[PDB]
Symmetry: C3
Subunit: 487 residues, 3 copies
C-alpha cells in the first residue's frame, strides 16, 4: 500500500543560514506526505573571567554591567551606607572575584525551534515554484489547525518542552463551611528552552506543508512528471536565531539598615557579558517520503510592512484565486528584532508582549529584648536570584475591515469578533480558538473545513490601531485557503 523512504540531501554538508536541496526519487506510483529530520549538535558557551570590584563593562544589548564598591549603590558614584557586594553563580555558590576561567554562561533554544529552523520552503519543477511558504505562515496556522489532542506530540516533534507534574507530601489544610489531608501539585520544565550549561543534541522533525501533503486523494503521480527535475529547497535559519545565552554570574547585594528594627536586605543583579557559543552541527539530515503503491487547495501567503499612524489600508496584490477563508496576523517588528532580549520567546507571537515580574522574597522577624516586644529587633528580607516572568500579549488591531471591489463587506468589526467569535462558531473540529489575541480569522464560507467541497468563496484590508507609529512598525501576515486546479 505505502512505504516511507529516506532521501539524503542533494547539497552536501548543510549549514545553519544556507540553503538545502532535496530531490524526489522514482520509487512509487504516488507520494503524499513528507517530513524532514535533522539533529542539531550539542551546545555550550565559553569560559569567562570574574571581574574585579568597582569594575564596569559593556554587556548584552548595549547595557552597562557593573560590580560596585562596598558603600555605594548599583551605580558606582552614589553612596549607599552598609552595602556589601559579592559574586554568585545562578544557583548561589560563591565565585571569588578576579579568578580567570571562573564561570560560564548558560545556553537555551528558542520557543518552537523546529518551526523556526525552516525559514523558507519552496517546491520547484524546472524552476517554476508551484508552492512556497515561510515560517510566519507555519506559526499562524499552528494556532488554528493543530487540534489539541495532537499538541503534545507536535511539541515533541518541533522540540518544544512540556511541563511535568509533581506532588508534595500530605498537609493539614482545614475546611471551613458556612481536618482533611491534602496534597499540592507543582509543575516543572526540563527541555531545550530551559537554560543549561550543556544542551544535548536536539532531534527535529518538521512536517512539510504542501497541497499534496494534506490528503491521500490529492497525491501527485510519480511518472506524470519525471523524477529528474522535482526539487525541494529550504532556506535554514542562522545559529543566532536559534540559541541564546543566560547569565552565569550574579552580583549579590547585602544591605544593613540600622534602626528599630534593624533590617537586612539581600538582592541580586545579573552580570551578563556575551560569550562564544560553539558552532552547531547538522547530522542525519533526511527527508522521509511516503510513497503509495497501487480541485486542489493552494495556501496563498503574503507579508507586508506597515508603519502608519492610527489606521491603515493595504491592498492585497498577490491574492488571485477564489478564497474560502483566511488567517490574518499583525506581528510587531520588535518581536523578531535582535535588540529584543525576549526574541527567543516572542518571535511567534502576534501582539505586543509585556512582562509582569514577580520577585518572591522570604521575610523573617526576630525580637529578643524580651521586655520591649512591641516592635521587633531584626527583620530579614531575602530575594530569589532570578524572578518569575509572565508574558502578557496585547492586540495591536482595534477594528478590522475587508473590502471587495466596490462594496465594504465588513464595516469595522472589533477585533474580538474575528479572534474569538469566528473561530468559535465556524470551523467545527478542524478549527480551534487560538490563545493568541492577535491572530484573526475571516470566513467566506458557512462550513470552512468541516467538509471537503467549497461552500462559498470570493480587495483591501483596513484597520484601526493605537500601537503602530514610525518606530513601532509591524508586518501583516496573510495566509489564505485558495482553490486552484491541477492538470
Amino acid at each position: 500500500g505505502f512505504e516511507y523512504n529516506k532521501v539524503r540531501p542533494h547539497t552536501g554538508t548543510p549549514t545553519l543560514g544556507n540553503k538545502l536541496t532535496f530531490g524526489i526519487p522514482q520509487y512509487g506510483d504516488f507520494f503524499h506526505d513528507m517530513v524532514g529530520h535533522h539533529i542539531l549538535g550539542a551546545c555550550h558557551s565559553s569560559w569567562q573571567d570574574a571581574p574585579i570590584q568597582g569594575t564596569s563593562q559593556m554587556g548584552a544589548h548595549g547595557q552597562l554591567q557593573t560590580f560596585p564598591r562596598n558603600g555605594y549603590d548599583w551605580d558606582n558614584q552614589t553612596p549607599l551606607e552598609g552595602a556589601v557586594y559579592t559574586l554568585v553563580d545562578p544557583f548561589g555558590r560563591p565565585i571569588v572575584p578576579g579568578t580567570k576561567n571562573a564561570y560560564r554562561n548558560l545556553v537555551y533554544y528558542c520557543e518552537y525551534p523546529g518551526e523556526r529552523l525552516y525559514e523558507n520552503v519552496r517546491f520547484d519543477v524546472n524552476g517554476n515554484s508551484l508552492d512556497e511558504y515561510s515560517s510566519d505562515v507555519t506559526t499562524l496556522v499552528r494556532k488554528f489547525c493543530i487540534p489539541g489532542d495532537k499538541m503534545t506530540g507536535y511539541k515533541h516533534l518541533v522540540g518544544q518542552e512540556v511541563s511535568v507534574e509533581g506532588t508534595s507530601g500530605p498537609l493539614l489544610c482545614n475546611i471551613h463551611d458556612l481536618l482533611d489531608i491534602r496534597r499540592n501539585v507543582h509543575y516543572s520544565c526540563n527541555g531545550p528552552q530551559t537554560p543549561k550549561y550543556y544542551q544535548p543534541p536536539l532531534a527535529l522533525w518538521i512536517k512539510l506543508r504542501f497541497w499534496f501533503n494534506e490528503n491521500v486523494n490529492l497525491a501527485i503521480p510519480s511518472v506524470s512528471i519525471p523524477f529528474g527535475e522535482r526539487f525541494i529547497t529550504i532556506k535554514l535559519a542562522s545559529q543566532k536565531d536559534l540559541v541564546n545565552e543566560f547569565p552565569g554570574l550574579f552580583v549579590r547585594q547585602s544591605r544593613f539598615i540600622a534602626g528599630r528594627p534593624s533590617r537586612r536586605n539581600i538582592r541580586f543583579k545579573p552580570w551578563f557579558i556575551p560569550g562564544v557559543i560553539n558552532e552547531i552541527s547538522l547530522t542525519n539530515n533526511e527527508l522521509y517520503i511516503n510513497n503509495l503503491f497501487v480541485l486542489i487547495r493552494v495556501h496563498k501567503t503574503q507579508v507586508t510592512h506597515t508603519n502608519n499612524n492610527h489606521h491603515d489600508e493595504k491592498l492585497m496584490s498577490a491574492l488571485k484565486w477564489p478564497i474560502e477563508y483566511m488567517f490574518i496576523g499583525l506581528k510587531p517588528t520588535w518581536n523578531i528584532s535582535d535588540q529584543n532580549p525576549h526574541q527567543h520567546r516572542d518571535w511567534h507571537k502576534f501582539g505586543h508582549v509585556v512582562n509582569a515580574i514577580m520577585q518572591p522574597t522570604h521575610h523573617a522577624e526576630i525580637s529578643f529584648q524580651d521586655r520591649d516586644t512591641a516592635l521587633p529587633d531584626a527583620c530579614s528580607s531575602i530575594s530569589d536570584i532570578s524572578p518569575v516572568t509572565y508574558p502578557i500579549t496585547l492586540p495591536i488591531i482595534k477594528n478590522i475591515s475587508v473590502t471587495a471591489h466596490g462594496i465594504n463587506l465588513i464595516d469595522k468589526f472589533p477585533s474580538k469578533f474575528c479572534s474569538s467569535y469566528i473561530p468559535f462558531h465556524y470551523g467545527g473540529n478542524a478549527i480551534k480558538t487560538p490563545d493568541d489575541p492577535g491572530a484573526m480569522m475571516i470566513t467566506f464560507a458557512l462550513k470552512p473545513r468541516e467538509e471537503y467541497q467549497p461552500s462559498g468563496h470570493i480587495f483591501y484590508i483596513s484597520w484601526d490601531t493605537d500601537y503602530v507609529g514610525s518606530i513601532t512598525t509591524a508586518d501583516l501576515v496573510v495566509s489564505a485557503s485558495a482553490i486552484n486546479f491541477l492538470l
Copy 2:
C-alpha cells in the same frame, strides 16, 4: 452568501435590571445566528475612613468587624498578653488609623458574567413566545456542549479570565535513581474576576441560543413572516448580581510569646465595611445578525423548587414532545443567595460547595547563646494577608430514577452513572464529560448528537438525597432536547 448586520435596541437607554428589546429587520432571505454585544462601564468603590482602635462596627453579611485594643484578643473583652494591632492595606502598606478617606475597597466581577447578564431570553411573534430560556439552562448546557478546543475563545467572549503561564530561573534539583538544571512553572490570573481598585470596561459577546441559531439549514425565512412583529426580549441581571467587593483594609496582629524559644506570630484579619460602587453604564448595545442570501429541535426547559427530606419525586408537567435526551441539575438555593459571600463564584455550580483554606506561613528559627544550642532562642511565624481558597463541589443527589407512565425505566442508578458514564459512552464528539459532579445526563437514543436524525425518543423524576432539608432547599433544572415541527 451571507453578511453580518448590527441592530440597535428598540428600547433606548438600557439599564441593569430592566428589559431590553431588539427588532429583527428585513435585509436577507434567511438569517440563522445572532450575537449580542454590550460594554459594561468602569467600576470603583467609594473612599472610606480608617477606624479608631478598640472600635467595632457591623460589616459585610451581618458580621461584626472589630479593631481590638493592645493586650486583648480578637474580641475586645478577653485579654491576650503581648498583642499589638495595626492596620494595613491588602498589599501590606500601613494606614495610620483615624485618617478620613484613608482606603478604598476593591471590586471584581462574577464568574462568567456574560452568562449571568442575560437573565431571561424570549422570542416573540405577535406575542406568542416561540422559544424562551434562562441563564441556568445556559450554564447547564455549557458544561456538556462546548467542546474544549473552543473553550478559551468562549471564555474571552463571556468575560471569564484565563490563567497565564510564567517561568522562574534555573535550579539545582538533584536526581535520585534506584545534577540537572530545572525550571518551575507558575500560573497567574489578571482578568475581571481578580479584585482591583479599578475595573476597566468589559466587553461581552453573548450568543443567542434558539433552534434557528444552531444550523444553517434550519434558518427561518425573512419574508415567511413579516419583519414588523418579530422581537427578542431580554431581561438583564442587576448590578448587585454582577459586581462584588473585596476588603481594602486588614488588621495586623503581632503577638510575642515569651519563653524558650520566644515566639513571634503575625496574623491578619479583614476589616470589611461595604461601600458604594458607582452605577455601571451600558454602551454599544448591538445585536449582530447573520443574514443569508440565496424537524426542528426546541430546547424545552423547566425549573422546580424542592425542600423535602431524604428523597423526592417531582412530576414533569411542562414536557410535551418526544425527547431524545436531557440534562438535569439540582442546584442549591444558597448558591444564588445574597447571604452567601461566595455567590460570585458558586452561582453556576450544581452542588454543595465547601472551601478548603490554606494559610501559608514563613517560619524562622534563630539561636545565639552559642553555648546552649539545643533549643533555639527565637521563632518567627508570619502569615500571608489573604489565604488560598479551594472550592470543593459535592453532589446533592445520591440515586436518581426517571419513570414513564406506568413502568420504572430506570431503577435507582447511582449518580456517578449519569454524571460520568453516560457522557463518557454516549454523545461522541458533541458531548463531553463535565467537571461538575451535579450535572447529569439522561439518554433515550443510542446516538444523541453524533448525527442529525432521531435514533430514539420518548413522567416522574425521583431521587434520594442527604443534603436537602427545610432550610437547605434546592432547585431542579431540566433542559431537554425535544423535537417539534415548524410550518
Copy 3:
C-alpha cells in the same frame, strides 16, 4: 429501544486475588455494552509504637530505619557535633518517644486502580474463550483511544484523582516594558492517591472491552446462542497490588553549626516500619448490561519477556488475522516489581522512570550587634518534611523495525517517529498523541480509525536498546486491531 439491567455475580462472596464469574441472562434481543461496578471498603493501618533513641530496626523494602543519639550523624556511629533528634508526625506535631500506640501509618491507592482491579478478563461460551485481555492492554489503549474531552469522566470512573484549582489574594507584581493587581493560581489533589489516615470506600466502574461492547451494529443476538452457557470470568488483583502505606513518623534533626554566622539547620528523615492494613471488602458487585429491543474487530494481544543486550528480535507467534494497526509498548519489569517503592505510580508506564526531588527550604538571616554588619550573626535553614517528587519517564527502545515474511517493511525508524509522528498524522479524531514516550503506534492503513471499513491490512519485531540487560529485563506488550468474522 434499550435498557440497562444489573446482574449479580455467579460466584458469591468475591475476594481480592480470586476469580469472579458473571452469567449473561435472557432479557433482550441484543446486548452491546457492559460495565462492572464494585465498591472497595474503607482502609486504615495499625497502631505502632514510637522507638527509643539510639534504636534501629529493619524497615520498608529492606532498608534500615534509625533514630540516632544526640551528637551523632544519621548513622549511630559517626559523630556529628551539635545534632539533636526528635520525633514528629507527617504534619509536624511532636510524638514523645517510647509511647506505645503512638502513631499510625497513612494509606493510599495505586494510580488508576480501576484499570488494575480487573487483572484478567475472558469471555466463555461452553469453554471456548472467544476473547481475552489483561490490564496492560487496557493501560496501553487508554493512552491512544480515550479522547480528552472524556478524560475527566474516565478518571472519575476508574478512581483516579483530579487536581482542584485555587486562588490567592491580590498582589502588587509590577510591570516592566522595554502597578497592576494580580492573583496566583495553585492546584491541589484530594482523592484516593493522596495519603490519608482513613480512606473512604471507593466506587469503581470498569468498562468491559470486547468487540460487541464497541458498536451497536455489532451487538450479538441473545437467542442466537443460549443464555445457559455465556460467562464472563474476571481474575481480580490482590490487596497488596492496590493499597500502599506512607510513613506516619519522621525523625527531625536540628543542627547548630557555631561560627560566623552561626547556622541552624533543620532536616527530616522518615521512620517507615510496615504495618497491617485491614482486609478490604467488596460490596455491590454488579454487572450493568445494556439490552437492546427491536466484519468484527478482535483485539489480539501478546506479552513476551525480554532480557537481551543492546538489540533484540522477537517473532510474533500469536498474531494470525490481517491487522489494520497495532500498539507496542516495552515496559520494564521493575515498574511492576514489589521491590519498587514507586510501584503504585509506575505500574502503568512504559519506560524507565527516574525521580527528580526538590527540597524547598526557608532561609533567614539575622544580624544583631549593629556595628559589624558585613556578614550576619545567624542563619536559619528549615526544610519541609517531605519533598516534591517529579517522575521523568525515559524511553527504552532506540530504533524499531517490523518485518514481514522476507522483506524488511520498516528499516530502523527512530522511536520518536512511531511515538509522536504516526499518532500525529494518522488516526484523526480517534487517535491522540500519548504523553508516554514508550508507547508506539505502527500503522498499516492510511485511515486507521477515522472510518469503519478496512483501508489496508497485512512477522518479526526488532529493536535496539541501551537499558535492557540481565537484571533490567522487560516485557513487550502488543495490542493489534485485527479483523475476524462472526457467524
